[PDB]
Design an enzyme around this catalytic site. Sequence first.
Site, PDB file in Angstrom:
ATOM      1  N   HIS A 154      -6.375   5.719  10.711  1.00  0.00           N
ATOM      2  CA  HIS A 154      -5.996   6.115   9.324  1.00  0.00           C
ATOM      3  C   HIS A 154      -7.150   5.815   8.377  1.00  0.00           C
ATOM      4  O   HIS A 154      -7.768   4.725   8.477  1.00  0.00           O
ATOM      5  CB  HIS A 154      -4.733   5.320   8.933  1.00  0.00           C
ATOM      6  CG  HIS A 154      -4.365   5.477   7.495  1.00  0.00           C
ATOM      7  ND1 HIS A 154      -4.230   6.719   6.928  1.00  0.00           N
ATOM      8  CD2 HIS A 154      -4.074   4.579   6.531  1.00  0.00           C
ATOM      9  CE1 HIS A 154      -3.910   6.585   5.656  1.00  0.00           C
ATOM     10  NE2 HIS A 154      -3.789   5.303   5.402  1.00  0.00           N
ATOM     11  N   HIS A 176      -8.020   5.282   4.337  1.00  0.00           N
ATOM     12  CA  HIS A 176      -7.473   5.159   3.007  1.00  0.00           C
ATOM     13  C   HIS A 176      -8.316   5.943   2.024  1.00  0.00           C
ATOM     14  O   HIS A 176      -9.461   6.307   2.351  1.00  0.00           O
ATOM     15  CB  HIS A 176      -7.529   3.687   2.593  1.00  0.00           C
ATOM     16  CG  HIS A 176      -6.479   2.840   3.258  1.00  0.00           C
ATOM     17  ND1 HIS A 176      -5.708   1.955   2.523  1.00  0.00           N
ATOM     18  CD2 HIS A 176      -6.101   2.687   4.554  1.00  0.00           C
ATOM     19  CE1 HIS A 176      -4.847   1.354   3.332  1.00  0.00           C
ATOM     20  NE2 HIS A 176      -5.067   1.767   4.560  1.00  0.00           N
ATOM     21  N   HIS A 181      -3.054  -4.146  16.283  1.00  0.00           N
ATOM     22  CA  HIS A 181      -4.485  -3.863  16.536  1.00  0.00           C
ATOM     23  C   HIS A 181      -5.228  -4.138  15.248  1.00  0.00           C
ATOM     24  O   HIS A 181      -6.287  -4.723  15.295  1.00  0.00           O
ATOM     25  CB  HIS A 181      -4.716  -2.396  17.007  1.00  0.00           C
ATOM     26  CG  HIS A 181      -4.052  -2.074  18.314  1.00  0.00           C
ATOM     27  ND1 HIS A 181      -4.086  -0.817  18.891  1.00  0.00           N
ATOM     28  CD2 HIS A 181      -3.335  -2.854  19.158  1.00  0.00           C
ATOM     29  CE1 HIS A 181      -3.423  -0.834  20.034  1.00  0.00           C
ATOM     30  NE2 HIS A 181      -2.960  -2.062  20.224  1.00  0.00           N
ATOM     31  N   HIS A 239       0.863  -1.178   0.000  1.00  0.00           N
ATOM     32  CA  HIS A 239       0.000   0.000   0.000  1.00  0.00           C
ATOM     33  C   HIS A 239       0.892   1.217   0.000  1.00  0.00           C
ATOM     34  O   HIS A 239       1.965   1.260   0.652  1.00  0.00           O
ATOM     35  CB  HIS A 239      -0.802  -0.009   1.277  1.00  0.00           C
ATOM     36  CG  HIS A 239      -1.497   1.272   1.576  1.00  0.00           C
ATOM     37  ND1 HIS A 239      -2.472   1.805   0.762  1.00  0.00           N
ATOM     38  CD2 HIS A 239      -1.380   2.106   2.623  1.00  0.00           C
ATOM     39  CE1 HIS A 239      -2.939   2.911   1.310  1.00  0.00           C
ATOM     40  NE2 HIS A 239      -2.290   3.111   2.439  1.00  0.00           N
ATOM     41  N   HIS A 247      -8.726   2.098   9.632  1.00  0.00           N
ATOM     42  CA  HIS A 247      -8.201   1.150  10.611  1.00  0.00           C
ATOM     43  C   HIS A 247      -7.262   1.820  11.558  1.00  0.00           C
ATOM     44  O   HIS A 247      -6.721   2.852  11.245  1.00  0.00           O
ATOM     45  CB  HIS A 247      -7.496  -0.064   9.911  1.00  0.00           C
ATOM     46  CG  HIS A 247      -6.272   0.311   9.108  1.00  0.00           C
ATOM     47  ND1 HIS A 247      -5.016   0.399   9.678  1.00  0.00           N
ATOM     48  CD2 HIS A 247      -6.118   0.687   7.805  1.00  0.00           C
ATOM     49  CE1 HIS A 247      -4.136   0.742   8.748  1.00  0.00           C
ATOM     50  NE2 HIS A 247      -4.772   0.909   7.600  1.00  0.00           N
ATOM     51  N   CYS A 248      -7.031   1.210  12.704  1.00  0.00           N
ATOM     52  CA  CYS A 248      -5.957   1.686  13.555  1.00  0.00           C
ATOM     53  C   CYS A 248      -4.605   1.334  12.936  1.00  0.00           C
ATOM     54  O   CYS A 248      -4.399   0.185  12.422  1.00  0.00           O
ATOM     55  CB  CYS A 248      -6.060   0.960  14.892  1.00  0.00           C
ATOM     56  SG  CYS A 248      -4.795   1.579  16.003  1.00  0.00           S
ATOM     57  N   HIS A 249      -3.666   2.285  13.006  1.00  0.00           N
ATOM     58  CA  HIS A 249      -2.391   2.033  12.368  1.00  0.00           C
ATOM     59  C   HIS A 249      -1.351   1.352  13.244  1.00  0.00           C
ATOM     60  O   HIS A 249      -0.172   1.282  12.848  1.00  0.00           O
ATOM     61  CB  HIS A 249      -1.761   3.318  11.768  1.00  0.00           C
ATOM     62  CG  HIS A 249      -1.082   3.046  10.465  1.00  0.00           C
ATOM     63  ND1 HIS A 249      -0.053   2.137  10.355  1.00  0.00           N
ATOM     64  CD2 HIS A 249      -1.311   3.525   9.210  1.00  0.00           C
ATOM     65  CE1 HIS A 249       0.360   2.103   9.089  1.00  0.00           C
ATOM     66  NE2 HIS A 249      -0.400   2.909   8.371  1.00  0.00           N
ATOM     67  N   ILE A 250      -1.777   0.920  14.424  1.00  0.00           N
ATOM     68  CA  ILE A 250      -0.959   0.062  15.241  1.00  0.00           C
ATOM     69  C   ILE A 250      -1.234  -1.325  14.634  1.00  0.00           C
ATOM     70  O   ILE A 250      -2.378  -1.830  14.653  1.00  0.00           O
ATOM     71  CB  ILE A 250      -1.331   0.167  16.735  1.00  0.00           C
ATOM     72  CG1 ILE A 250      -0.954   1.600  17.216  1.00  0.00           C
ATOM     73  CG2 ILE A 250      -0.595  -0.966  17.539  1.00  0.00           C
ATOM     74  CD1 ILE A 250      -1.518   1.937  18.581  1.00  0.00           C
ATOM     75  N   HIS A 299      -4.564   5.470  19.806  1.00  0.00           N
ATOM     76  CA  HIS A 299      -4.723   4.779  18.551  1.00  0.00           C
ATOM     77  C   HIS A 299      -4.648   5.745  17.398  1.00  0.00           C
ATOM     78  O   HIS A 299      -5.489   6.639  17.292  1.00  0.00           O
ATOM     79  CB  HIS A 299      -6.086   4.075  18.469  1.00  0.00           C
ATOM     80  CG  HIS A 299      -6.278   3.081  19.554  1.00  0.00           C
ATOM     81  ND1 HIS A 299      -5.779   1.793  19.479  1.00  0.00           N
ATOM     82  CD2 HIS A 299      -6.804   3.229  20.792  1.00  0.00           C
ATOM     83  CE1 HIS A 299      -6.052   1.174  20.629  1.00  0.00           C
ATOM     84  NE2 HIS A 299      -6.648   2.034  21.448  1.00  0.00           N
ATOM     85  N   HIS A 327       4.098   0.394   2.515  1.00  0.00           N
ATOM     86  CA  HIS A 327       4.306  -0.659   3.481  1.00  0.00           C
ATOM     87  C   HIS A 327       3.476  -1.853   3.064  1.00  0.00           C
ATOM     88  O   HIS A 327       2.485  -1.702   2.373  1.00  0.00           O
ATOM     89  CB  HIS A 327       3.936  -0.227   4.952  1.00  0.00           C
ATOM     90  CG  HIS A 327       2.531   0.286   5.152  1.00  0.00           C
ATOM     91  ND1 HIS A 327       1.438  -0.543   5.312  1.00  0.00           N
ATOM     92  CD2 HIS A 327       2.063   1.550   5.298  1.00  0.00           C
ATOM     93  CE1 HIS A 327       0.360   0.195   5.540  1.00  0.00           C
ATOM     94  NE2 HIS A 327       0.708   1.482   5.547  1.00  0.00           N
ATOM     95  N   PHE A 382      -9.148  -4.349  14.278  1.00  0.00           N
ATOM     96  CA  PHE A 382      -9.497  -2.952  14.484  1.00  0.00           C
ATOM     97  C   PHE A 382      -9.581  -2.244  13.130  1.00  0.00           C
ATOM     98  O   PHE A 382      -8.670  -1.478  12.736  1.00  0.00           O
ATOM     99  CB  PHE A 382      -8.426  -2.279  15.378  1.00  0.00           C
ATOM    100  CG  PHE A 382      -8.876  -0.972  16.020  1.00  0.00           C
ATOM    101  CD1 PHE A 382      -9.789  -0.133  15.396  1.00  0.00           C
ATOM    102  CD2 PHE A 382      -8.322  -0.570  17.233  1.00  0.00           C
ATOM    103  CE1 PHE A 382     -10.160   1.075  15.985  1.00  0.00           C
ATOM    104  CE2 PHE A 382      -8.641   0.632  17.813  1.00  0.00           C
ATOM    105  CZ  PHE A 382      -9.580   1.461  17.196  1.00  0.00           C
ATOM    106  N   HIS A 408       0.925   4.628   1.225  1.00  0.00           N
ATOM    107  CA  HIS A 408       0.173   5.249   2.331  1.00  0.00           C
ATOM    108  C   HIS A 408       0.008   6.733   2.103  1.00  0.00           C
ATOM    109  O   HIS A 408       1.014   7.463   2.065  1.00  0.00           O
ATOM    110  CB  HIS A 408       0.855   4.997   3.659  1.00  0.00           C
ATOM    111  CG  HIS A 408       0.165   5.659   4.812  1.00  0.00           C
ATOM    112  ND1 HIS A 408      -0.309   4.935   5.894  1.00  0.00           N
ATOM    113  CD2 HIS A 408      -0.140   6.962   5.054  1.00  0.00           C
ATOM    114  CE1 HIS A 408      -0.852   5.781   6.763  1.00  0.00           C
ATOM    115  NE2 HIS A 408      -0.778   7.007   6.271  1.00  0.00           N
ATOM    116  N   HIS A 442       0.640  -4.489   3.314  1.00  0.00           N
ATOM    117  CA  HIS A 442      -0.695  -4.350   3.851  1.00  0.00           C
ATOM    118  C   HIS A 442      -1.294  -5.716   3.797  1.00  0.00           C
ATOM    119  O   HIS A 442      -2.490  -5.866   3.580  1.00  0.00           O
ATOM    120  CB  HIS A 442      -1.554  -3.283   3.047  1.00  0.00           C
ATOM    121  CG  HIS A 442      -2.409  -2.403   3.934  1.00  0.00           C
ATOM    122  ND1 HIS A 442      -3.349  -2.905   4.808  1.00  0.00           N
ATOM    123  CD2 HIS A 442      -2.413  -1.046   4.107  1.00  0.00           C
ATOM    124  CE1 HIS A 442      -3.885  -1.897   5.499  1.00  0.00           C
ATOM    125  NE2 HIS A 442      -3.342  -0.758   5.078  1.00  0.00           N
TER     126      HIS A 442
HETATM  127 CU   LIG Z   1      -4.899   0.759  17.923  1.00  0.00          CU
HETATM  128 CU   LIG Z   2      -0.638   2.946   6.337  1.00  0.00          CU
HETATM  129 CU   LIG Z   3      -3.086   4.315   3.837  1.00  0.00          CU
HETATM  130 CU   LIG Z   4      -3.770   1.101   5.874  1.00  0.00          CU
END
Ligand SMILES: [Cu+2]
Ligand SMILES: [Cu+2]
Ligand SMILES: [Cu+2]
Ligand SMILES: [Cu+2]
Length: 497
Positions: A398, A400, A456, A64, A450-453, A395, A109, A461, A66, A111
């Site tokens: 993010h 997309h 998670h 992906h 989604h959470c970017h951790i 958290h 990164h 998440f 980002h 995905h």
């Molecule tokens: Cu999170």
């Molecule tokens: Cu990302």
């Molecule tokens: Cu993204």
């Molecule tokens: Cu993402």
Amino acid sequence: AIGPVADLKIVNANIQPDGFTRPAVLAGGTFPGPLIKGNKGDNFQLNVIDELENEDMLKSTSIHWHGFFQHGTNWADGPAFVNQCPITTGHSFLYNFHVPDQAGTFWYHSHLSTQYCDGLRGPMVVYDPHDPLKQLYDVDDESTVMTLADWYHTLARQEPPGPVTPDSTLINGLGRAPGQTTPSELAVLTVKRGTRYRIRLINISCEPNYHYSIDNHDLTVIEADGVSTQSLTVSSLTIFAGQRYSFILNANQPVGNYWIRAQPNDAADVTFNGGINSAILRYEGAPVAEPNTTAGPDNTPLLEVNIRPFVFTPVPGQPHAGGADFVKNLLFSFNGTNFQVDNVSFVPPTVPILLQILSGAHTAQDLMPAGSIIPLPKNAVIEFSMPGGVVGGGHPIHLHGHNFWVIRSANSSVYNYNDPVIRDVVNIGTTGDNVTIRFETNNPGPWFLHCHIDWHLDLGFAVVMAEDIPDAAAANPVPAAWNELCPLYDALTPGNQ
Ligand SMILES: [Cu+2]
Ligand SMILES: [Cu+2]
Ligand SMILES: [Cu+2]
Ligand SMILES: [Cu+2]
Ligand SMILES: *[C@@H]1O[C@H](CO)[C@@H](O[C@@H]2O[C@H](CO)[C@@H](O)[C@H](O)[C@H]2NC(C)=O)[C@H](O)[C@H]1NC(C)=O
Ligand SMILES: *[C@@H]1O[C@H](CO)[C@@H](O)[C@H](O)[C@H]1NC(C)=O
Ligand SMILES: *[C@@H]1O[C@H](CO)[C@@H](O)[C@H](O)[C@H]1NC(C)=O
Ligand SMILES: [Zn+2]
Ligand SMILES: [Zn+2]
């Protein structure tokens, strides 16, 4: 650097960025991956060539880009089982897309599952030859991209259940882990005295946020998550997973070595003991040695509430709470083992959501898993509130396909309907916070939120924004190679995945 047209090989290699040797999943065989670059308006043609062989970190992959909106190229967005099936080892897949209307600091990164934690993450910059902030700095190039990365000694898929904590912080791919008997190699950013640099600071971590500062130097922040901002000179900033800031570093101090400090919120050791969580800012001519400097009082930290877009960019909809076409309070929770959005934990479907759409889904209500679908109407103003509170952060949420105005930031009671920051990853804080964002739906297709951790995300998440689904197939024509992805991926055995 590589790009806008390039091959990107994805390979296994053993590395020791903090002195500990472990296998990894690496774009271009390095950690972090190579800088991918282009100018505003360019056609990126990134031929991702999957040469992975280590099942322990997955042999398939999916990348992906980002922060890029991918308008009309939803199929190139990357999230496995939302926008494509993963690429299989022995094969390649060409991500072919344009960036007509963005210029800023981004990153790329994996995905697919938690694979980016195992190493597949790198910086990506779209330069603007007409950048209005050009006259504020002298140098802006590959040397001024600075990545902050967490790093784990256990493979991502071998992490035990429950909270995961990094072993070290890597700045530009290097850093020390705690407990070393001889200190390992520190990253060094070299600067010429009197020169102003645009440092493009990217948190490519799977988890921590970093409180970042440079001894004896202030930071003049000029960009947040791809969007240029009014200059704001600060003593430090805090940067969450997936966020970016450009700042001007003015190398105006005496020739010497100065600590760059990146203090993670959580890790094996959060201090600077032994020079961990640190890198070196070296003036040309300074000794090849560690800095002896100390951090200042930190009286003017960056606060998200203070960041203003460089180009005035008003908030769409009406300037009160609920003043938009579609308004939703997103409830994030944790049931003891998994995260949920509005009571549903994300479970990736076997048929990727965009393939369901191209196979004939009439609308969002045809999509699976239905419990994770939020339908968004076309050409509308959307307002989401995302109250903090769920365990694990802090958290960084993010979206997309979109960036958004942050009407209300964490740790702030202010609703700014006038000139809030625009970004694409926002910290929702904790119980008592009610971060509230708006965006416009001018981008048909299924887009992850989604959470970017990453841990998670793996625990569910996430939700899918199903935007203007009746137009999504026609708006996102796919290349033949994209139709071959699922047949190839589904032909693999579990697990040769
Ligand atoms: Cu999170
Ligand atoms: Cu990302
Ligand atoms: Cu993204
Ligand atoms: Cu993402
Ligand atoms: C976070 O903000 C949302 C949006 O304002 C709040 O939900 C609204 O609450 C008002 C006041 O009760 C209601 O009249 C609205 O109908 C709600 N809107 C939506 C879309 O649900 C929410 O209560 C806030 N949460 C916290 C924890 O402060
Ligand atoms: C939490 O939700 C997950 C995902 O739906 C479910 O499988 C799991 O058993 C639940 N855990 C608990 C403790 O209820
Ligand atoms: C919130 O902001 C204030 C002042 O800007 C700061 O002093 C405090 O540490 C922050 N609180 C939290 C809970 O992060
Ligand atoms: Zn570890
Ligand atoms: Zn239908």
